[PDB]
Design a protein around this motif. Structure first.
Motif, PDB file in Angstrom:
ATOM      1  N   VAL A  69       0.817  -1.209   0.000  1.00 32.09           N
ATOM      2  CA  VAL A  69       0.000   0.000   0.000  1.00 32.09           C
ATOM      3  C   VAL A  69       0.856   1.266   0.000  1.00 32.09           C
ATOM      4  N   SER A  70       1.925   1.260   0.788  1.00 32.24           N
ATOM      5  CA  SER A  70       2.831   2.399   0.859  1.00 32.24           C
ATOM      6  C   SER A  70       3.369   2.724  -0.529  1.00 32.24           C
ATOM      7  N   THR A 115       2.184   1.733  -3.449  1.00 30.72           N
ATOM      8  CA  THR A 115       1.082   2.055  -4.351  1.00 30.72           C
ATOM      9  C   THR A 115       0.618   3.504  -4.199  1.00 30.72           C
ATOM     10  N   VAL A 116       0.337   3.912  -2.966  1.00 23.78           N
ATOM     11  CA  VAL A 116      -0.155   5.262  -2.705  1.00 23.78           C
ATOM     12  C   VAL A 116       0.917   6.325  -2.961  1.00 23.78           C
ATOM     13  N   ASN A 117       2.140   6.064  -2.511  1.00 24.62           N
ATOM     14  CA  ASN A 117       3.224   7.031  -2.666  1.00 24.62           C
ATOM     15  C   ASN A 117       3.603   7.280  -4.122  1.00 24.62           C
ATOM     16  N   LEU A 169       1.509   6.974  -6.637  1.00 24.07           N
ATOM     17  CA  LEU A 169       0.363   7.655  -7.223  1.00 24.07           C
ATOM     18  C   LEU A 169       0.377   9.157  -6.946  1.00 24.07           C
ATOM     19  N   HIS A 204      -1.926   1.316 -11.474  1.00 25.33           N
ATOM     20  CA  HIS A 204      -1.131   1.967 -10.437  1.00 25.33           C
ATOM     21  C   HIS A 204      -1.001   1.085  -9.197  1.00 25.33           C
ATOM     22  N   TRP A 235      -1.917  11.141   5.128  1.00 29.95           N
ATOM     23  CA  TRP A 235      -1.131  10.070   4.524  1.00 29.95           C
ATOM     24  C   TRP A 235       0.374  10.275   4.668  1.00 29.95           C
TER      25      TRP A 235
END
Lengths: 103, 103
Positions: free
Chosen positions: A92-93, A95-97, A99, B33, B89
């Protein structure tokens, strides 16, 4: 602070997995690693629950200074789950970072 | 994949904030992504809810190719909340990532 709670159980398992700690010692470390809102009072119910689910376990040991405290250590079940957390988190880290830096 | 859902609403807002997209276009971007589990079917109820809370809004526009699709754009309320997500975040990301590399 609503999201800090999502990952708090996992960070607690990480910390306990690395060192036997008593309640006050735990929350102090949490504070100084950036969980500024946590207190023994606020995480207590979470500690009671993590015990009831057998992720961690407290035992009365003598301190380096003598007085007996309730130190928590991680169970095998707790370690398994810690590994699950580390895997999910890195996923998740990443993936989100990735993006949030597109432009 | 239980945690991927925590941050999915925020990543959806980010993507929509950057480009008007229709449903299939959105989930394709999410897939590529790194949200490999998402499909139009699985995120649909989340899209319906984000609309009902006025975070995003769909309007029938003509496509660059002609056929009319339901493109989603972000509302002011949605943008405010996107900023909240970005702040939370970066905080949690920094906190957890620093912790999990102590040794």
């Amino acid at each position: 602070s609503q999201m800090l709670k999502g990952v708090l159980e996992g960070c607690i398992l990480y910390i306990i997995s690395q060192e036997e700690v008593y309640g006050y010692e735990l929350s102090t470390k949490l504070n100084k690693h950036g969980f500024t809102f946590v207190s023994e009072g606020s995480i207590y119910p979470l500690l009671l629950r993590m015990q009831k689910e057998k992720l961690i376990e407290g035992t009365l040991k003598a301190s380096s200074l003598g007085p007996k405290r309730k130190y928590y250590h991680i169970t095998d079940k707790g370690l398994e789950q810690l590994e699950e957390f580390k895997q999910s988190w890195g996923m998740v880290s990443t993936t989100v970072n990735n993006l949030l830096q597109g432009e």
